[PDB]
Amino acid sequence: PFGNTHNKYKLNYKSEEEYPDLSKHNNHMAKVLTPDLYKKLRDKETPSGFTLDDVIQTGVDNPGHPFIMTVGCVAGDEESYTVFKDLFDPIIQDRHGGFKPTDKHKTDLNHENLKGGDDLDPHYVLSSRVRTGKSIKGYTLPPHCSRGERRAVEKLSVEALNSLTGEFKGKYYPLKSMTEQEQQQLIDDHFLFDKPVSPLLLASGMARDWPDARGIWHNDNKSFLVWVNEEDHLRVISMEKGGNMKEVFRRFCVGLQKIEEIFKKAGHPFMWNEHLGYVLTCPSNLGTGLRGGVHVKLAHLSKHPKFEEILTRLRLQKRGTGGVDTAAVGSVFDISNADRLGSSEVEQVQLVVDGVKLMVEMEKKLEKGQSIDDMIPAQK
Amino acid sequence: PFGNTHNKYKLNYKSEEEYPDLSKHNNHMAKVLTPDLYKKLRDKETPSGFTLDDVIQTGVDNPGHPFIMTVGCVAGDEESYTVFKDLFDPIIQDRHGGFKPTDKHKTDLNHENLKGGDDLDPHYVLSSRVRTGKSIKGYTLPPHCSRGERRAVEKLSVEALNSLTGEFKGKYYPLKSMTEQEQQQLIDDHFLFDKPVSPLLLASGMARDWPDARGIWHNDNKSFLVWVNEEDHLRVISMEKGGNMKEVFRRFCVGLQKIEEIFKKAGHPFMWNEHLGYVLTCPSNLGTGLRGGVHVKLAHLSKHPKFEEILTRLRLQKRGTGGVDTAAVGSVFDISNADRLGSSEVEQVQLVVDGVKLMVEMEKKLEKGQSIDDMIPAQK
Numbered sequence: 171p172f173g174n175t176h177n178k179y180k181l182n183y184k185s186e187e188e189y190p191d192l193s194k195h196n197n198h199m200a201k202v203l204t205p206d207l208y209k210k211l212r213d214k215e216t217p218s219g220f221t222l223d224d225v226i227q228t229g230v231d232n233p234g235h236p237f238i239m240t241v242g243c244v245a246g247d248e249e250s251y252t253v254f255k256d257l258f259d260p261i262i263q264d265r266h267g268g269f270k271p272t273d274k275h276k277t278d279l280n281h282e283n284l285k286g287g288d289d290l291d292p293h294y295v296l297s298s299r300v301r302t303g304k305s306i307k308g309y310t311l312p313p314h315c316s317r318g319e320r321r322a323v324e325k326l327s328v329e330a331l332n333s334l335t336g337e338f339k340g341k342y343y344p345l346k347s348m349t350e351q352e353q354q355q356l357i358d359d360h361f362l363f364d365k366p367v368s369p370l371l372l373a374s375g376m377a378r379d380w381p382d383a384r385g386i387w388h389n390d391n392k393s394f395l396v397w398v399n400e401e402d403h404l405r406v407i408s409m410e411k412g413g414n415m416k417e418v419f420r421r422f423c424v425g426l427q428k429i430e431e432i433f434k435k436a437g438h439p440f441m442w443n444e445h446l447g448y449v450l451t452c453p454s455n456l457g458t459g460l461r462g463g464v465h466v467k468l469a470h471l472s473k474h475p476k477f478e479e480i481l482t483r484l485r486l487q488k489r490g491t492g493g494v495d496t497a498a499v500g501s502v503f504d505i506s507n508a509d510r511l512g513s514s515e516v517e518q519v520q521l522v523v524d525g526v527k528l529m530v531e532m533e534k535k536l537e538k539g540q541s542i543d544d545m546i547p548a549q550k
Numbered sequence: 551p552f553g554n555t556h557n558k559y560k561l562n563y564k565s566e567e568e569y570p571d572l573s574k575h576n577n578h579m580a581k582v583l584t585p586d587l588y589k590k591l592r593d594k595e596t597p598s599g600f601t602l603d604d605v606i607q608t609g610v611d612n613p614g615h616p617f618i619m620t621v622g623c624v625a626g627d628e629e630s631y632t633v634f635k636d637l638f639d640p641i642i643q644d645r646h647g648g649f650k651p652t653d654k655h656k657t658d659l660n661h662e663n664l665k666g667g668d669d670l671d672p673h674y675v676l677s678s679r680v681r682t683g684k685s686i687k688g689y690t691l692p693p694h695c696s697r698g699e700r701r702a703v704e705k706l707s708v709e710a711l712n713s714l715t716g717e718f719k720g721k722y723y724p725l726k727s728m729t730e731q732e733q734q735q736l737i738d739d740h741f742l743f744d745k746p747v748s749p750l751l752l753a754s755g756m757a758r759d760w761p762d763a764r765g766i767w768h769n770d771n772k773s774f775l776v777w778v779n780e781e782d783h784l785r786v787i788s789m790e791k792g793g794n795m796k797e798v799f800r801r802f803c804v805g806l807q808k809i810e811e812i813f814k815k816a817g818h819p820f821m822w823n824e825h826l827g828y829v830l831t832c833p834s835n836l837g838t839g840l841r842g843g844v845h846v847k848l849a850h851l852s853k854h855p856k857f858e859e860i861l862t863r864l865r866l867q868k869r870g871t872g873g874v875d876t877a878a879v880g881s882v883f884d885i886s887n888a889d890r891l892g893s894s895e896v897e898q899v900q901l902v903v904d905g906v907k908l909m910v911e912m913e914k915k916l917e918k919g920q921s922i923d924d925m926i927p928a929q930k
């Protein structure tokens with residue numbers, strides 16, 4: 171029982187007979203997979219039984235489209251990254267600016283190392299936010315995890331979160347028993363998540379048993395939010411209105427370390443290693459898993475020839491006002507760090523603080539009508 | 551499905567820790583599963599590694615359906631129906647209107663014994679269709695089949711179908727070779743299976759690797775078609791405009807017999823036993839696998855307070871114009887026999903002809919300002 175009968179059954183076919191048809195594909199996985207790599211890795215399994223087929227399924231199912239390259243693969247556990255390193259390493263190097271198999275990732279959650287960021291001009295910066303994801307050692311990741319493992323993650327997380335006090339006193343809302351009123355309240359506060367609709371996620375198996383053992387915790391102040399068992403075991407978000415990113419990041423680090431110490435005592439620390447930093451399902455999110463950002467009104471700078479170039483130079487990214495696929499209603503852009511792996515949490519938020527400060531100074535010159543042609547920084 | 555099929559850590563959790571939460575689920579699986587059944591069968595697997603969790607996943611994920619009552623489980627191979635018989639048999643009994651473990655599949659080949667059905671009123675009955683499914687013995691079914699297995703089924707099936715002659719002369723059209731426009735036209739014209747959007751198809755693992763090794767075979771005038779590797783290895787279809795169900799059924803039965811003769815001669819017989827008849831993925835499609843029905847315009851009858859009761863009395867199922875996952879458009883309903891095991895093809899098509907003729911007579915009475923109170927049919 172509970173063995174490898176399934177993969178052994180597939181191994182009755184030759185490697186070419188099981189090899190995916192990637193002729194229409196444009197994703198990182200398809201860029202790297204070869205007939206030889208598939209042949210060499212198809213009989214391998216992690217201790218939990220995760221296989222190369224499981225790693226690549228989403229990339230097989232979702233070819234991609236013209237420009238933006240999707241990753242096209244997932245990890246099912248920490249071991250996936252080692253057992254299938256011959257696939258993941260080139261993907262990680264390509265996705266994360268050349269990060270090599272021998273490179274090390276530096277973690278830094280000491281919020282005191284951030285400099286400034288309490289001052290971001292409220293007239294332009296409408297809100298500040300820091301998000302990360304975390305995995306819990308001892309449990310496989312959402313593509314793979316059993317109902318039993320998922321429930322164990324939820325129990326540990328909820329008991330931990332229920333123990334928090336002061337600024338971090340809060341309450342958990344299971345998706346399965348959520349009242350209509352609770353759901354509406356969470357929507358009003360931009361705290362709700364629903365079953366994923368993205369085929370990139372659905373194709374990996376991560377949505378099984380929905381909504382079993384999924385839920386949302388937030389503190390009474392509505393400034394610290396935790397999603398349980400969505401894309402990763404945990405998603406942890408600190409947010410508030412205005413431009414005190416210093417306070418947002420402080421709260422983020424303190425709450426994250428409080429949770430960490432409880433998990434560590436239970437023998438289930440956050441999944442982490444010196445090479446990849448914090449381990450998560452998607453290779454794109456390794457390292458810090460961190461997206462620190464602001465909603466910032468850039469009426470003129472938005473409509474400027476070098477706007478996309480300035481973001482690139484500052485190592486920043488932009489999205490709409492309502493998320494990843496939105497058109498920035500009014501003039502409000504979601505600006506955040508582009509980096510994840512090979513730089514620390516402090517370094518990434520510092521880039522956001524420093525970069526957003528410069529871009530507000532730039533916009534102030536533009537609304538007067540001065541030239542933005544000297545403040546343009548070197549590529550960071 | 552997915553990696554979770556072979557998650558080796560399920561061993562490490564208690565049965566009650568892995569047991570699904572089926573509270574407020576309304577499908578046949580959830581009506582039957584118990585803690586004891588789960589405990590008994592959770593450590594079992596078929597020779598290809600299909601497990602109880604794979605059987606039930608769609609019924610966990612899909613508590614209900616917007617249009618019909620669903621079975622909530624699938625088979626992954628022939629052996630599924632034996633290994634997990636204690637779950638399947640009560641579901642089959644419920645779904646097929648009382649078919650007991652001691653009852654036997656029925657067929658004759660006597661399609662000419664259909665009484666009437668050559669003259670369904672074409673003002674109401676816009677098209678007539680008869681389908682069934684077949685599985686190739688020795689290959690796993692769509693929820694579980696590997697890319698290699700699926701490809702093997704496609705290769706042998708196309709070779710066999712290409713040997714059809716006479717009114718059944720046709721050819722194969724691989725899904726990957728169709729343009730978006732060509733695919734959409736075939737779907738709009740009701741010939742080709744939809745994009746992989748069914749909650750059953752998705753949740754159970756049947757959409758993996760799409761569109762690899764899927765396609766449609768058909769004769770030149772598209773009156774006789776075979777889908778390859780959608781929900782079943784084969785779906786054999788006869789259809790045409792208008793109300794000559796007898797002719798549709800003639801073509802179906804003669805064609806199906808030619809197919810099975812060809813497959814047997816090639817050494818690729820279908821999955822079959824004396825109890826369940828022909829074995830297919832969904833328990834609802836066992837026995838003859840036959841779903842015979844019409845697109846019928848019921849503007850008045852569909853608004854009558856006893857519409858659903860009448861359908862139940864007649865043992866007919868209602869679906870949308872674009873099939874099970876769609877709504878009726880322009881009051882055009884897909885009306886077909888609900889049950890497939892414990893009766894023959896002729897009995898099934900006779901039940902459709904008789905029921906549809908009654909419903910058309912009801913529609914006509916309601917159009918004329920008369921009532922149908924006196925015409926409600928006895929429970930079949």
Ligand SMILES: Nc1ncnc2c1ncn2[C@@H]1O[C@H](COP(=O)(O)OP(=O)(O)O)[C@@H](O)[C@H]1O
Pocket residue numbers: 297298299301360409461463464465489491492493494504
């Ligand atoms: N700086 C911000 N201020 C307020 N809300 C934000 C901010 N950044 C993101 N959001 C909100 O969080 C949601 C998720 O955004 P999304 O781009 O998916 O973010 P992430 O991937 O970090 O979760 C959106 O609905 C959006 O309204």
Ligand SMILES: Nc1ncnc2c1ncn2[C@@H]1O[C@H](COP(=O)(O)OP(=O)(O)O)[C@@H](O)[C@H]1O
Pocket residue numbers: 677678679681737739740741742743785789841843844845869871872873874875884
């Ligand atoms: N009587 C009919 N006439 C024309 N098309 C039909 C008829 N019945 C079903 N269909 C079509 O068959 C396709 C599949 O519908 P679906 O509900 O999935 O049925 P099946 O049991 O064959 O899988 C749909 O495109 C639908 O419009």
Ligand SMILES: CN(CC(=O)O)C(N)N
Pocket residue numbers: 619620621622750781832834835874
């Ligand atoms: C709609 N189905 C029946 C069911 O889900 O019970 C099919 N496709 N087997």
Ligand SMILES: [Mg+2]
Pocket residue numbers: 494
């Ligand atoms: Mg997001």
Ligand SMILES: [Mg+2]
Pocket residue numbers: 781873874
């Ligand atoms: Mg169908």
